[PDB]
Design a protein around this ligand. Structure first.
Ligand code: 2IN
Length: 247
């Protein structure tokens, strides 16, 4: 997250931290995620497409820091990694960048609701907030495009939804952005999501309720003028989400 503020897991109870084990024992951070149900975390497919092995991932809930523990946190193994089959990456656009991670603790249990661990509500069929609406994003991603390290503490910021018409302008992204994607940015281009925030949640208050409106997917640079963040439009994938989370 470029700019924005430091926050704790208490303020983002549905945020899931995903790590990958390496040969030797070194675990590195991979991507953000969101707990949508006790046994399921939703994220982005491009985070795992190069290493489809479920056995090498670790999911953390109730965690506020990157490389240290937090009281109340819970560790999970990935029982099943569901990548979208029509995923593809073009020059800039990442299509169908969405993924499901079924989780289970070593005792074979799913997440237990606490003050630091809660689910986030999914939207309704083609029912998104009005353009110009403020939403929030959370992540352990870069604070500056030039950094090579990630902040140790979780962060968040607020951005506004941009209309599909505006995001499709020549100086923005042109035809790279489709209706399955959502654009959001700070009107002053000061704050934004960045490398390392992928798979994290774009939350919007819709009719007095926090809703997982999007998933951090892509963008040109970070906090660059007329280069909004692009998010996978959750509302267009409900059918896909339900068919894979049943049995
Ligand atoms: N809101 C943003 N600007 C933003 C959101 C998410 C990411 C994370 N996702 C990726 O990096 C995946 N790749 C991209 O978006 C690529 C194009 O397909 N564009 S990029 O190379 O400009 C992103 C980038 C990479 C390294 C450092 C800064 C920016 C980056 C920027």
């Amino acid at each position: 997250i470029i700019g924005g503020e430091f926050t704790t897991i208490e303020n983002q109870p549905w945020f899931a931290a995903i790590y990958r084990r390496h040969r030797g024992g070194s675990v590195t951070y991979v991507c953000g995620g969101s707990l949508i149900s006790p046994c399921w975390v939703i994220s982005a497919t491009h985070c795992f497409i190069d290493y489809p092995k479920k056995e090498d991932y670790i999911v953390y809930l109730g965690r506020s820091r990157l490389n240290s523990n937090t009281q109340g946190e819970m560790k999970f193994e990935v029982e099943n990694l569901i990548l979208h089959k029509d995923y593809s990456a073009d020059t800039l656009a990442h299509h169908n960048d969405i993924a499901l991670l079924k989780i289970r603790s070593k005792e074979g249990r799913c997440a237990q609701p606490s003050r630091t661990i809660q689910t986030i509500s999914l939207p309704s069929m083609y029912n998104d907030p009005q353009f110009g609406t403020s939403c929030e994003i959370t992540g352990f991603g870069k604070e500056n495009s030039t950094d090579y390290l990630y902040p140790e503490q979780l962060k968040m910021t607020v951005v506004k939804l941009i209309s599909h018409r505006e995001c499709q302008q020549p100086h923005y992204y042109g035809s790279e952005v489709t209706t399955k994607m959502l654009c959001a940015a700070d009107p002053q281009w000061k704050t934004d999501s960045c490398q390392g925030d992928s798979g994290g949640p774009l939350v919007c208050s819709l009719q007095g309720r926090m809703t997982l409106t999007g998933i951090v997917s892509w963008g040109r640079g970070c906090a660059l003028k007329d280069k909004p963040g692009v998010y996978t439009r959750v509302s267009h994938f409900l059918p896909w989400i339900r068919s894979h989370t049943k049995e």
